[PDB]
Subunit: 339 residues, 4 copies
């Protein structure tokens, strides 16, 4: 019933990466042929789906693992630039229906800062979406986290442009994959490993003071917060009543609840559960929750039939469905934006 | 107000390991001197606390990381035997207040099976409590998981004795620690890493068919299920609607909800949140939730004041507080067991 | 697709009361012709609905206001006897699909007790269902309540036979209707007036000591408890911390939560809300919640599609759907009872 | 330890009505002497409580049953004028701690509108608080409801001044008390009768079109909405899917959820339940929930210790504790308003 919804965990892939798309689809799709067409399509099938399910605006982003899988910094940077140029041309076809997040190589803070700036200033991109850590090292076995002082120049750019950063998952790779996941591989992705990566990274940003140095910074997590709201009580207790008396306070000046009120957002991507949504409204607050889908790994029908029909007060259905995002991303009018 | 409560995530340490106890306390306690005395005491301070807070019975278990930190199999086995002999003598002082879980070396399935059998048949231990994977390899960088066919002999022993297995966390070590945790070390333990280990292991047991080969097996998780109930909807969706059409059904014959109804238990250790408890009652069911404390990392006061005073229907307060555990562990009478 | 569900707020009417049936339908049905057919049918339409929606067993009862609308005691008693004899003959056609509640005139405690006893002993009825207070007095403007010593012989018959009593609503009538409802007539029935009557009556039983004199007595309320769970905290507070220091304790010896654990049941009739069900699971406990429909005022489709597909743990879906009622009504078998 | 909280179901009585005050206290207080002192005090005991419990601002109102108990219209109106003049003088001593609601005789719409207007324009009162229906008729056994066209001039005055109307309960009286309550008298007041009256009246305003004729009108209910949120699903179902196909749509143009998003507020007075608050956050939305106490029938300690320490996200703690009310009542400053 609700129209003008905004979705913002919505992936695309370059047409020239069909092999990579099919490999990823072999893990996460039950219809590879349909998946290939849907993840590459922008302006036809995606619009048909959105027209049928009351989605007015979609903020598109590059599929995982995307650029974060690329450990050669020169190749990674060139791919990020290529993807951003590509999607900017695609969204120009229907700008009243689509915006985009920047795709970044995260090998170098200044390089990523400059490319984010290019995307926002040249193309009007709405923020950045990065698939967790950047693979690095001679054969990609290292990983680059962004929760340290080397990345201050990048987070300062996010706050200067006043745009959010969506911390999306990626698959485990290298030694981590071999040690923890190969022998229980069906847990890779949405069932468990994705959330383990994102929650580690975002709570690393918390405990390493990123939101203290950059109190304006907005970080978004999918999948109703990648487990974190479930342990809001336990994290807060073990911070305020334990670790904050042992040294954590030196690099973490506020409570986990403060950071969720001031800095962190969660979306409903891939987690179409009213019971869990209700629990998140208590632990995080409806003001900090955004509707999203996770297309094409999830269907518009599943996400939108769920949300349109969920038992929910009308105030929060409007906020989660579009008004929260309209404010956060400073959106102009779009289809059914005031319907 | 409720008396005769049962707690079963309650740790002790051997008096001769004071240095190890102090190191662990430097991470997880704000009063090392009191912690040292409390984790070694069995029959005096522990009883004073329990008498003040309506705890009739405690099932004791060895502190983490315990034997799972020991990668030399000969040393590990000898320590497990030592600990079990020690605690059996300690609980004989007040058997109406204390039982114990077996402490095991998990280097070898048959060895662990035999020691569990010794503990149950000789000492009347109530089950096993193991701190996640067993460190192994020449310098302890390897880890032994129990979700495979080599461990069938061990899980068959659990079901033959009809006793549960409590999958407790341990700290990350070796390469995993260096790669994921050293640069965000305040997340080690209760704030995040503990739950990541246990949930991986237990969901590995699920997806590798342990509960299919051993449908009577009962596994217990602390900390309200180590995130898993939060993603019950998402795991079930990505199993039944995705991975089960891609190959998971070959080694996983039931739904995640079936396994929580038939095989898995959660406790309230270290997670004194009525809002989260309510959400777990919806996702898991009050019949599958056990009260516990996590002493001495948590206080009796915190856990028992919370639970005694939580808004809760009287049926579930009695079940979670003691009647669920009385049935699961086939308990004879104990202090206030019918009060 | 749970099978073998039990529903027990399921109404029929005598064919000879068509004019009265059409008047009730003019208030509470959008399709009077289908309503007349459905409320008078026992063994065809009703069975077809149950076959399509996984309902194995239904306990049938007489429509409201029913005998409680009849203020002439002789006419009322003869009608009750007629109804019970009638429904006994009809449910003989499908004893594995139907049981019945006794229909009673509640003008006289001994008369009602004798007729309940005849129904149970002669016909195997499962209990009694009564539409709130009995209309009485010259023109029916008086009300007979059952929460007093005159009714002890009746409550004792319920506990002796060990069958429950379903306190169903009826419409407001006479001076009460004129004074409170006529100027806001769209609130009559399920929107408000029904719950106001039942909660008054049942909380009257509580505060007048009925469950103290008859501790084994089981009372069932529909519609998730007619508001009472919403105020569980508030009622308990204003009893234990206020009124029970001013005189209530003289006739009310347990807490409201005690009575919901020991004496009171709620059903899901006409209240197909998972959010509200979850809240009742917290305030009342899943052990004390029964599935029901409220057919034909509600459809099988609405009730069963909601419950079959509600997000709920498997343990509580089985209990609420059938196992709670199977135990309460001592059902050893019926269609799909162990499906 | 949230400071600057706003409470607004906070009662006073005139010193000259001591006998009436002691009678009300005999029903609803366990300490009559303290009650008399607290309900008549404005500027000493009340301020001390607020200083100790983080309440910056209180909107005071006259005790129930108040002017609504007075069936002589001339006496009732003179009493209202007296009360408003009185409380205006008392709150001048602490304008950064107190505002007031108008006390009204509701015998005549124009008379009430004129007195509300005098209170707002002359004294800066914040709205009106009325104890349900106005007693009227020879011996006060009649009731005046406000959900009809006669009261349009009054509702228009509320929207013109842009101030809300608090529908507070009163005791049942006369024939209604005798017929429904006298034989179960411990249910009178907070346990049940209060909510039955207020929900009847407010849902009467809904179904008689008051919010359609006056879409800007704001109505406040105490006690987490007097049961209505519990039946949000059921009311909405029986309106939109039943009664609105039989005639309700002629005088009721929006859904019940619409009216709770646009016109109706609930407060936490006398209902210090986080479980129930969470449920109301789902059914009503945190934006429409206001903190309040119900002093001196409830203590500051109970209300404020509950709310200050409730598990709640930080965003909603600030909104419910003060920011919602700050916006509704256009408060630019008061003690600790931005603390
Ligand atoms: Ca006919
Ligand atoms: Ca005096
Ligand atoms: Mg995604
Ligand atoms: Mg522990
Ligand atoms: Mg019914
Ligand atoms: Mg009040």
């Amino acid at each position: 019933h609700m129209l003008g919804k905004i979705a913002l965990e919505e992936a695309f892939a370059l047409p020239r990466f069909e092999e990579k798309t099919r490999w990823w689809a072999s893990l996460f799709s039950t219809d590879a042929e349909t998946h290939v067409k849907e993840i590459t399509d922008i302006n036809k099938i995606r619009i048909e789906h959105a027209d049928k399910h009351g989605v007015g605006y979609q903020i598109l982003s590059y599929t995982a693992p995307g650029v974060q899988d690329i450990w050669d910094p020169v190749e990674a940077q060139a791919l990020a630039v290529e993807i951003n140029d590509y999607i900017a041309e695609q969204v120009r076809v229907n700008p009243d229906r689509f915006g985009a997040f920047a795709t970044l190589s995260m090998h170098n803070p200044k390089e990523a800062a400059d490319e984010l700036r290019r995307c926002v200033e040249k193309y009007g991109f709405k923020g950045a979406l990065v698939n967790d850590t950047q693979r690095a090292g001679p054969d990609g076995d290292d990983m680059i986290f962004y929760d340290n002082a080397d990345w201050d120049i990048f987070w300062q750019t996010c706050t200067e442009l006043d745009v959010p950063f969506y911390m999306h998952p990626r698959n485990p790779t290298g030694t981590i994959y071999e040690k923890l996941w190969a022998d229980r591989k069906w847990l890779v992705g949405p069932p468990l490993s994705f959330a383990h990566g994102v929650s580690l990274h975002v709570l690393g940003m918390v405990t390493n003071g990123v939101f203290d140095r950059h109190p304006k910074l907005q970080i978004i997590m999918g999948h109703l917060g990648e487990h974190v709201p479930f342990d809001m009580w336990r994290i807060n207790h073990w911070f305020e009543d334990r670790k904050k008396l042992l040294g954590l306070a030196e690099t973490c000046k506020k409570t986990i609840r403060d950071y969720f009120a001031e800095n962190i957002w969660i979306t409903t991507s891939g987690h179409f559960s009213t019971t869990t949504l209700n629990f998140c409204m208590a632990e995080v607050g409806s003001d900090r929750i955004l509707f999203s889908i996770d297309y094409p790994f999830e269907t518009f029908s599943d996400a939108c039939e769920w949300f349109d029909n969920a038992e929910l007060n009308g105030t929060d259905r409007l906020k989660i469905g579009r008004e929260n995002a309209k404010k956060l991303f400073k959106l102009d009018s779009y289809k059914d934006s005031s319907a």
